[PDB]
Amino acid sequence: TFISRFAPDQPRKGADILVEALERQGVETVFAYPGGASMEIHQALTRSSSIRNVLPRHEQGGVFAAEGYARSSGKPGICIATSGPGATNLVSGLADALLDSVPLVAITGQVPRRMIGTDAFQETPIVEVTRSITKHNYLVMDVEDIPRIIEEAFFLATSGRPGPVLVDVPKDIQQQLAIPNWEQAMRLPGYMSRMPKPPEDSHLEQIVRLISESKKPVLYVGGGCLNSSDELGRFVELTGIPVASTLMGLGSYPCDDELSLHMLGMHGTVYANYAVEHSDLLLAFGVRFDDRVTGKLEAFASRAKIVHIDIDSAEIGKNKTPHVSVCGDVKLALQGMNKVLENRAEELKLDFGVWRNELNVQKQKFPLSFKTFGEAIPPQYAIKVLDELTDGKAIISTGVGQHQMWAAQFYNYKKPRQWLSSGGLGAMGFGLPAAIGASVANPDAIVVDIDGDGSFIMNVQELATIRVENLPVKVLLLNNQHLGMVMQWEDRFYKANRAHTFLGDPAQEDEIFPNMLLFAAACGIPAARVTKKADLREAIQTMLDTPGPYLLDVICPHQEHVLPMIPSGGTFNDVITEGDGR
């Protein structure tokens, strides 16, 4: 039973109705940056005793923090911005959350209703702008619609395939006095009618039948499995089927487990990609068959019967036509299959030991590898040390680039929602704000942002947010003085012709630039730089043991390349396993 700060017969501002609407949704944390059009909302926020605001230093920081909050908790992330320049600063985050299917509710202030469409002060047609990059959005046109729209926004953001919903609120609506009705019905008849029913037995038994008739089965798991760890784990025990994971699915199945093939795809392991290439049964759970994984579609799992379980019917049969499919929650599908597999266990007698041994040979022949040059720090090694010292239990957020791939390759995530990374949109500047949100959502957790120098500086202003909010965010900065991933493609495909990928100062090219230590010092955050591999272990240990925020600048040779690599639109036979920029 919810307790309002207002009397049931007492009129109050629309802004106070909106904040209470958030409280009734169970919101405990928002990331709000004030402005003229959203002042009333911020005033109402101070009157709330249950909602905490984390003030960012940039609204892109705000929305990325809401993302990190969401990805690390499974709860909706909430960001708030003013009209115009505030709203437009959210755009990258909205698109990011849509492509990665992250539950997010964004609230934007708007100019008074009568002035909409008149090029007014700080006016942006944000509903128009963000229509194609949100799951849904709203323009609130009456104070009385606030309770319903807020309820629908949270419902849409969190149900089905999760995604961002934006709610645009005119200033005069925030100022209008009214008595809210909290017991109004949502108006989503179309959406509700298309919500998948629980998986039917006929389809699940079809899958179990294929499993018993296969000899080379492979699990292909992704972001859709993040809430299905126990079920998936149970499924693997009952079948003995090896697990290949997408970038978004890392940790759904324990990466340190023997049955784990780790990540597949463009920079996936040789043995994971091998498994899919030679499989006769592909169990695609919570994945969307993106070309970063599949490469050339006709060659992808070309000899396999494909099972696809997705909660979004639009994804099933999009890029590849499955032999068997289930449109529904993979969590429920796993539960259903686990019961069948258990009851018929002594009848099925599942044993893919020969297939598994074939894959273990591939693990031995072509494991993840890196080269150590003198006392220079291998970025791959730095992440391995982090894994060891944190016992693989840390929450890891990243930027985008080489360091992102290495963070995905050389850290064995034991649970889902440890791994926070922009996959679909691949937005630089994501790491630090996402770590902020994750730390607020998980106050007792070890939170580390494994960032690149290009990515880190993009939202470096959020260091101020970290200090002021006293968040124990660790920054493991893999510093190669380059836009590394672009540099790598220049090396492989453009004869190493540099086109604006160097991030240092050419007038002093053998000096580390900028000095990231001083960025941290500016915000009262303790920091250090390590250059020799021998000192790396103690340096990381110091970062972890030092209470509160900490920045470790890890200097790395820039000639490193991410391996293996399947070229764009290529096949498994095109995989590159050696070479760098030396």
Ligand X SMILES: C/C(NCc1cnc(C)nc1N)=C(/S)CCOP(=O)([O-])OP(=O)([O-])O
The residues that touch ligand FAD, with contacts defined as CB under 6 A, are 100-101, 121, 161, 222-224, 246-249, 263, 265-268, 286-288, 290, 292-293, 309-312, 315, 329-331, 400, 404, 423-424, 426, 485
For the question of residue 122 being annotated catalytic, the response is yes
Of 67, 110, 171, 488, which residue is the catalytic one? Answer: 171
Is residue 163 a contact point for a copy of itself (CB under 8 A)?
no
Torsional sign, CA 343, 242, 572, 358: negative
Q: Which of 10, 121, 360, 388 binds a copy of itself (CB under 8 A)?
A: 121
Name residues contacting a copy of itself, limited to 521-550 (CB under 8 A): 521-524
Please report how the helices 379-389 and 533-545 are oriented relative to each other, as an axis angle in degrees rounded to 10: 40
Q: 122, 175, 206, 461: which is the annotated catalytic residue?
A: 122
State which of residues 366, 489, 502, 513 lies at the interface with ligand PXD (CB under 6 A).
489
**Is the Cβ of residue 251 or residue 452 nearer to Mg ion in the bound state?**
452
Q: Catalytic site residue 171?
A: yes
How many chain residues interact with a copy of itself (CB under 8 A)?
A: 104
How many CA atoms are closer than 13 Å to the CA of 532, on its beta-carbon side?
3
Q: Which of 181, 470, 541, 577 binds a copy of itself (CB under 8 A)?
A: 470
Strands (E), 291-420: 305-310, 324-327, 395-398, 419-420
Contact segment (CB under 5 A) with Mg ion among 164-172, 296-304, 317-325, 477-485 equals 477-485
Alpha-carbon distance of 486 to 309, in angstroms, equals: 35
Query: Nearest to ligand PXD by Cβ — which residue?
Result: 36
Residues near ligand X (CB under 6 A) are: 33-35, 82, 85-86, 89, 399-403, 426-429, 452-455, 478, 480, 482-486
Q: In what order do the strands lie in the sheet with 473-479?
A: 419-420, 395-398, 447-452, 473-479, 550-555, 527-530
Token pair, residue 203, equals 């389809």
Helix 229-239 crosses helix 330-343 at what angle (to 10 degrees)? 30
Nearer to a copy of itself, 49 or 508 (CB): 508
State the Cα angle at 567 between 561 and 569, rounded to 5°: 155
Q: Confirm if 463 and 432 have CB atoms less than 8 A apart.
A: yes
Closer Cβ to ligand PXD, 112 or 581, answer by number: 112
Q: What angle do CA 349, 355, 358 make, to 5 degrees?
A: 155
Q: Residue 68 has which token pair? A: 């990190």
CB of 400 to ligand FAD, least distance (A): 5
569 lines the binding site for ligand PXD (CB under 6 A): yes
321 makes contact with ligand PXD (CB under 6 A)? no
250: buried, middle or exposed (CB in 10 Å: 19+, 13-18, 0-12)? buried
Residue 551 interacting partner from Mg ion, ligand PXD, a copy of itself, none (CB closer than 5 to 8 Å by kind): none
Q: Classify 169 as helix, strand or coil.
A: strand
Residue type, 449: D
For the bound state, the minimum distance from the C-beta of residue 129 to ligand X, rounded and expressed in Å, comes to: 15
Residue type, 399: G
320 belongs to an annotated ligand binding site: no
> Which residues, including other chains, have CB under 8 Å from residue 96's CB and lie 6 or more apart?
63, 64, 67, 102, 422, 424, 425, 427, 430
Of residues 7 through 36, those in contact with ligand PXD by CB under 6 A are 36
Contact between 486 and ligand PXD (CB under 6 A)? Answer: yes
Interface with Mg ion (CB under 5 A), residue from 124, 176, 480, 501: 480
CA 231 to CA 285: how far, in whole Å?
12
Q: Which of residues 91-150 bind ligand PXD (CB under 6 A)?
A: 111-112, 115, 120-122
Q: Which does 100 bind (CB under 5 to 8 A by kind): ligand FAD, a copy of itself, Mg ion, none?
A: ligand FAD
Q: Comparing C-alpha atoms, which of 27, 279, 331, 3 is closest to residue 157?
A: 27
**β-pair type (177-178, 12-13):** antiparallel
The answer to the question of residue 37 lying near ligand PXD (CB under 6 A) is: yes
- Would you please indicate which residues are annotated as catalytic (active-site) residues? 59, 121-122, 171, 485
Which residues line the annotated binding site for chlorimuron-ethyl?
171, 291-292, 489, 568
Which residues line the annotated binding site?
59, 101, 122, 135, 161, 171, 223, 246-247, 264-267, 286-292, 310-311, 329-330, 402-403, 423-424, 426-428, 453-455, 480-485, 489, 568
